[PDB]
Design a protein around this motif. Sequence first.
Motif, PDB file in Angstrom:
ATOM      1  N   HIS A  38     -93.475 -55.394   5.756  1.00 40.88           N
ATOM      2  CA  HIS A  38     -94.242 -56.607   5.534  1.00 40.88           C
ATOM      3  C   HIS A  38     -93.423 -57.632   4.763  1.00 40.88           C
ATOM      4  O   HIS A  38     -92.476 -57.305   4.047  1.00 40.88           O
ATOM      5  CB  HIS A  38     -95.537 -56.307   4.775  1.00 40.88           C
ATOM      6  N   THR A  39     -93.809 -58.894   4.921  1.00 37.98           N
ATOM      7  CA  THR A  39     -93.216 -60.004   4.193  1.00 37.98           C
ATOM      8  C   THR A  39     -94.192 -60.617   3.199  1.00 37.98           C
ATOM      9  O   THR A  39     -93.975 -61.736   2.730  1.00 37.98           O
ATOM     10  CB  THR A  39     -92.716 -61.066   5.168  1.00 37.98           C
ATOM     11  N   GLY A  40     -95.265 -59.904   2.872  1.00 35.40           N
ATOM     12  CA  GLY A  40     -96.256 -60.384   1.927  1.00 35.40           C
ATOM     13  C   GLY A  40     -97.034 -59.222   1.354  1.00 35.40           C
ATOM     14  O   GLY A  40     -96.871 -58.072   1.764  1.00 35.40           O
ATOM     15  N   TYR A  41     -97.892 -59.538   0.393  1.00 33.12           N
ATOM     16  CA  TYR A  41     -98.572 -58.505  -0.370  1.00 33.12           C
ATOM     17  C   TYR A  41     -99.618 -57.790   0.468  1.00 33.12           C
ATOM     18  O   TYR A  41    -100.281 -58.387   1.318  1.00 33.12           O
ATOM     19  CB  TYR A  41     -99.230 -59.103  -1.606  1.00 33.12           C
ATOM     20  N   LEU A  42     -99.773 -56.496   0.207  1.00 30.76           N
ATOM     21  CA  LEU A  42    -100.797 -55.701   0.866  1.00 30.76           C
ATOM     22  C   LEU A  42    -102.139 -55.900   0.180  1.00 30.76           C
ATOM     23  O   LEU A  42    -102.219 -55.964  -1.048  1.00 30.76           O
ATOM     24  CB  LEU A  42    -100.422 -54.221   0.843  1.00 30.76           C
ATOM     25  N   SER A  43    -103.200 -55.993   0.977  1.00 32.87           N
ATOM     26  CA  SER A  43    -104.540 -56.158   0.445  1.00 32.87           C
ATOM     27  C   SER A  43    -105.456 -54.975   0.707  1.00 32.87           C
ATOM     28  O   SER A  43    -106.387 -54.754  -0.066  1.00 32.87           O
ATOM     29  CB  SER A  43    -105.181 -57.420   1.024  1.00 32.87           C
ATOM     30  N   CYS A  44    -105.223 -54.211   1.772  1.00 33.83           N
ATOM     31  CA  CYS A  44    -106.034 -53.040   2.064  1.00 33.83           C
ATOM     32  C   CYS A  44    -105.222 -52.058   2.890  1.00 33.83           C
ATOM     33  O   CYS A  44    -104.327 -52.448   3.644  1.00 33.83           O
ATOM     34  CB  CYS A  44    -107.316 -53.410   2.806  1.00 33.83           C
ATOM     35  N   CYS A  45    -105.545 -50.776   2.744  1.00 28.02           N
ATOM     36  CA  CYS A  45    -104.860 -49.717   3.475  1.00 28.02           C
ATOM     37  C   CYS A  45    -105.863 -48.622   3.795  1.00 28.02           C
ATOM     38  O   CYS A  45    -106.460 -48.042   2.884  1.00 28.02           O
ATOM     39  CB  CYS A  45    -103.694 -49.159   2.667  1.00 28.02           C
ATOM     40  N   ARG A  46    -106.055 -48.346   5.079  1.00 31.38           N
ATOM     41  CA  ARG A  46    -106.971 -47.312   5.532  1.00 31.38           C
ATOM     42  C   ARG A  46    -106.228 -46.313   6.405  1.00 31.38           C
ATOM     43  O   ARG A  46    -105.387 -46.694   7.223  1.00 31.38           O
ATOM     44  CB  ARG A  46    -108.135 -47.904   6.321  1.00 31.38           C
ATOM     45  N   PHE A  47    -106.538 -45.037   6.225  1.00 29.62           N
ATOM     46  CA  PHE A  47    -105.982 -43.996   7.067  1.00 29.62           C
ATOM     47  C   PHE A  47    -106.722 -43.941   8.393  1.00 29.62           C
ATOM     48  O   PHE A  47    -107.849 -44.423   8.526  1.00 29.62           O
ATOM     49  CB  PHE A  47    -106.088 -42.639   6.389  1.00 29.62           C
ATOM     50  N   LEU A  48    -106.074 -43.344   9.386  1.00 28.89           N
ATOM     51  CA  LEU A  48    -106.719 -42.991  10.643  1.00 28.89           C
ATOM     52  C   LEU A  48    -106.734 -41.488  10.866  1.00 28.89           C
ATOM     53  O   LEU A  48    -107.769 -40.914  11.214  1.00 28.89           O
ATOM     54  CB  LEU A  48    -106.018 -43.687  11.816  1.00 28.89           C
ATOM     55  N   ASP A  49    -105.592 -40.840  10.676  1.00 27.93           N
ATOM     56  CA  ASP A  49    -105.495 -39.394  10.573  1.00 27.93           C
ATOM     57  C   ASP A  49    -104.319 -39.105   9.649  1.00 27.93           C
ATOM     58  O   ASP A  49    -103.882 -39.981   8.896  1.00 27.93           O
ATOM     59  CB  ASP A  49    -105.370 -38.749  11.963  1.00 27.93           C
ATOM     60  N   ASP A  50    -103.810 -37.880   9.688  1.00 28.50           N
ATOM     61  CA  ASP A  50    -102.696 -37.536   8.816  1.00 28.50           C
ATOM     62  C   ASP A  50    -101.414 -38.269   9.202  1.00 28.50           C
ATOM     63  O   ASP A  50    -100.565 -38.514   8.340  1.00 28.50           O
ATOM     64  CB  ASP A  50    -102.463 -36.029   8.839  1.00 28.50           C
ATOM     65  N   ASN A  51    -101.252 -38.623  10.474  1.00 27.28           N
ATOM     66  CA  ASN A  51     -99.974 -39.106  10.980  1.00 27.28           C
ATOM     67  C   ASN A  51     -99.895 -40.621  11.147  1.00 27.28           C
ATOM     68  O   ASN A  51     -98.854 -41.119  11.583  1.00 27.28           O
ATOM     69  CB  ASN A  51     -99.659 -38.432  12.315  1.00 27.28           C
ATOM     70  N   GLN A  52    -100.940 -41.373  10.813  1.00 24.57           N
ATOM     71  CA  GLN A  52    -100.855 -42.818  10.958  1.00 24.57           C
ATOM     72  C   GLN A  52    -101.736 -43.503   9.925  1.00 24.57           C
ATOM     73  O   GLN A  52    -102.615 -42.889   9.316  1.00 24.57           O
ATOM     74  CB  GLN A  52    -101.231 -43.264  12.371  1.00 24.57           C
TER      75      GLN A  52
END
Lengths: 338, 218, 56, 274, 236
Positions: A140-154
Amino acid sequence: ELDQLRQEAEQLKNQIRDARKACADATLSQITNNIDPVGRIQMRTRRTLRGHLAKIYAMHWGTDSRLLVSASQDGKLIIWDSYTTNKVHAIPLRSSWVMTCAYAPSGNYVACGGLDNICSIYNLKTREGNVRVSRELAGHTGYLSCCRFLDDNQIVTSSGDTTCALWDIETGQQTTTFTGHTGDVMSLSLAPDTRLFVSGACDASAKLWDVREGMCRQTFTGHESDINAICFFPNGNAFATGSDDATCRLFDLRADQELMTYSHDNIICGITSVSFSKSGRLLLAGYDDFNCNVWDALKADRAGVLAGHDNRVSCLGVTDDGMAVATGSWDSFLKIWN
Amino acid sequence: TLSAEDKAAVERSKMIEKNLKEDGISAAKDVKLLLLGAGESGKSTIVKQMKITGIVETHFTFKNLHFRLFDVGGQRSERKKWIHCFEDVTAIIFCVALSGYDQVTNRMHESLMLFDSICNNKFFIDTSIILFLNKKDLFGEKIKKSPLTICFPEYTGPNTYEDAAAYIQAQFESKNRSPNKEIYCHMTCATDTNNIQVVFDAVTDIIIANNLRGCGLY
Amino acid sequence: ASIAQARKLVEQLKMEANIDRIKVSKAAADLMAYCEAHAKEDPLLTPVPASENPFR
Amino acid sequence: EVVFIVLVAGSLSLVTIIGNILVMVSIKVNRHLQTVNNYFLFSLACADLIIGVFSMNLYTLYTVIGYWPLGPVVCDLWLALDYVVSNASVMNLLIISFDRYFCVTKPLTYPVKRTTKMAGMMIAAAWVLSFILWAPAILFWQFIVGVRTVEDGECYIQFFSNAAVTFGTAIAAFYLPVIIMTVLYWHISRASKSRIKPPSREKKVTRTILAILLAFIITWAPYNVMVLINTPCIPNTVWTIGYWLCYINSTINPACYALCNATFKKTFKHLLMC
Amino acid sequence: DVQLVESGGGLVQPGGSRKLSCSASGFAFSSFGMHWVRQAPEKGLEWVAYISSGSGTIYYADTVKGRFTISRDDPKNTLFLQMTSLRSEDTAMYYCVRSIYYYGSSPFDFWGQGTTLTVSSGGSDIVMTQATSSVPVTPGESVSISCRSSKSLLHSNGNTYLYWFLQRPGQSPQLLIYRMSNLASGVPDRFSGSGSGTAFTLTISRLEAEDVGVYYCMQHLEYPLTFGAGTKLELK
Ligand SMILES: Cc1c(Cl)c(OCC(=O)N2CCN(C)CC2)nc2sc(C(=O)NC3CC3)c(N)c12
Ligand SMILES: CC(=O)OCC[N+](C)(C)C
């Protein structure tokens, strides 16, 4: 030819608006004119988790409705036991500036991120004791605002460069990039089937994607300022968004338009978190005016106040069984409610 | 007392509580500073004068005192979203280029607007500012050939260095309305030998004021 | 270079302008039905006693 | 006549109780307001509380009639406790003076070098010194001399006649803190100025510091000069006030030490409103 | 890798004293809890001493208190046991195990190798009884083994504490099932557990030829730990 394309876009938007107006026969309130009110909701603080030293910026429940991740800019990511106010792991972060945290649905990994443009994934089930860093995703070239998992591998993240990303943890690459917004995207939420998600940026819009191919499906615009929180209805056909014009809105998916707006004259502050209950009758929203409100999610009438915080409430999460709601504020504390 | 095998768990919990408390005590001994500026403000000139993508943190110790300088000019996005993460800092170092007869809208006007915006922000209503006015040489060379009235038409007075600089400084200082905080000013040259001492003195004064207000004695 | 951006924008609008639509009242009634079906097992609006509350 | 005095006494008692309870509950729940500096004010805030209830109401019981209703069965214990808690209050003030002087004169190394344990040690020392300095002599001058000089109709200090003991106790418990506190505060005022070179910082500090010193000295002077006087004139009624005067600063010093913080006053507003 | 190796054995005449050192490499040793477990030449497993992380809590068996002592040196990551005033009831081989505890942890997950010490000639403790001692088996069959306690092992927290252990001939034991239902790490799906209160059972389905040995059950409700006599397995 730029004027020609502008005219074509104006014609297309006029057609979309006309279709939306045509399909709108009656509002939700008239259909919900008969249902009895749910009455005032009494909620008392049960647990007060008191460990941090600075302002908590994010939380996330586990899958078993007992464990809880907390991220605060004292450099700390600590996981709790809600039932017995215990701490099971403390994790010191490489970067102190943190605005997101995720707990994997399998309980094996956690994720964190912030202003330093890198999402770090921490293991939990190592055979050598402590918990260690497994990958540092960085595209990324900017700040992260949220992060959600989908499974263990992504993993799926949204960052202040007006874009969203689906990664691949094992390799480290960026399996797909979603672009099309105009300003800083600040929220993200996944539908139950983990096939499509909605994101709302600071350009007063919320757009819905599909994770397989990246083609945006729908754009919703009702608001008048930045949108700082998004959550889903449990059945994946509606979602609730919280803006900074002192109102939160319930949007539909198949009807392709807005259903309800929630706002009160006494309220002028800005929403920082929105969530539902398990059934889908109550809406819980945390405000900058140092408390939380409960809205009848089919009547718009306020039905109680979760008060008791001495500063702005940032994170707000209900469990996977509907047993408690956990609210975390800049008062470094974290409270549990039934 | 009714606990069975959870007695261990509680030992581990208090152990990590002790680690958190000790880490906090050891990490409250470092000064935190935030470095702002405008385009071509010379903020790169004083970052290198300190000797040991995203946020650039520089570390140095002087006269047995920790320091941390958090350059955030690498963020290209809306400022009103991440400024609040930098509340509870000790000082804001604001660099202004004294070359004030150019266009990017005069550069000084952008500097004044930015300074007014950052000094009347709701979060920094009581956070102090160390103000550096860089390029005190080049400005001295340029003032002879051009009048200061081009930047500030209202100005009337001598066209010398010693008064034009003072007028600029006062026009900057006139942007604060809080009764608590303060602006510390200095006019660093392009290559002066020691201006880390000014930062040291300013931070000592800020700490003394904070202690006095905390004890209630103020 | 703005020509490519305009073409992409109009293409996206055309792609998103070809979606079917159910009626608004139908979806409102569907939400009402789902909310009224799952009312029992919600421990937030039907308060649960002190015997099966884990946080009590 | 009696209604006015009982009303004023009850008013002072209630205001003192509520003020100190609010101070302690405030320091307990504001997260940030919890500091090393605030614990020497977490001590005092409790010590006066006892005086805020016991001596307050019991001098009210004897304040009026004129005869000790209780004889020497509780008179010794009450009087000893009263003198011990008041001296504890003075000692808490003294340790706050030390804390401020060290947090202003040496601002860099000092605020971190000391841990919670050192502060607790100082608190316990301030309490135990007062306990040992007053409770034993007051309680056991009976057996030390072998007679009960105090008659049953009134309550007073057993050793009122022994010049050395009365001097020693009074001179310590009042006249050492006066000089120590005044010296330390004058140095703090001297060293509070800004070495960098619209009232100044020094002006506000000197105003507040003179307020505190003058209030304390005016409140505690006349009693501690009459005590020196006796060892022979009996106000018999005039010195009734003295006790009342000496109780007054057990009622106002929460405002003189926790209503100027301005961080505590905001919490007071939040607590009262909510 | 994880490695625990012990040293300090041999032969001593009665009455003497010795010191045993267990050296560790491959994990965060300071964050664990160390145990000691001994084994007589013919009998089963017996418990000796326990030291925790931070060395706050130390526990001893009844037949050991006063004589032996335990210590740890975590900067140099080695565990120590000092033995004084020995007896002929100490001829045995000794072990070194780790017992990390938190919500969801797995105690007794790695067992050391064991040092052999021999000496020449010179009421609420919970009792646990394994019924059968020898059970002939055939490959591919299903075998159920039992363990009955004396006190109910179901605490109020909803948990019950019985651990199962396997010991191949001439090696160290490995942990199979912890807390009556949880399958440990690195062990196949075949094994499973069940039971109620006191009567506890372990089921092996489609038994292979690599699972011969002896099986044990252990309690962890309260100290001191008490094992069972074990149940042996033999082919044909
Ligand atoms: C300070 C004090 C003392 Cl030292 C005292 O007795 C000590 C004394 O001077 N003497 C000399 C004469 N002897 C007969 C007896 C012992 N007696 C009272 S009574 C009272 C009050 O405040 N009020 C009286 C009206 C109820 C006092 N402050 C007080
Ligand atoms: C301690 C001392 O010398 O005087 C205290 C008298 N009292 C109880 C009226 C305050």
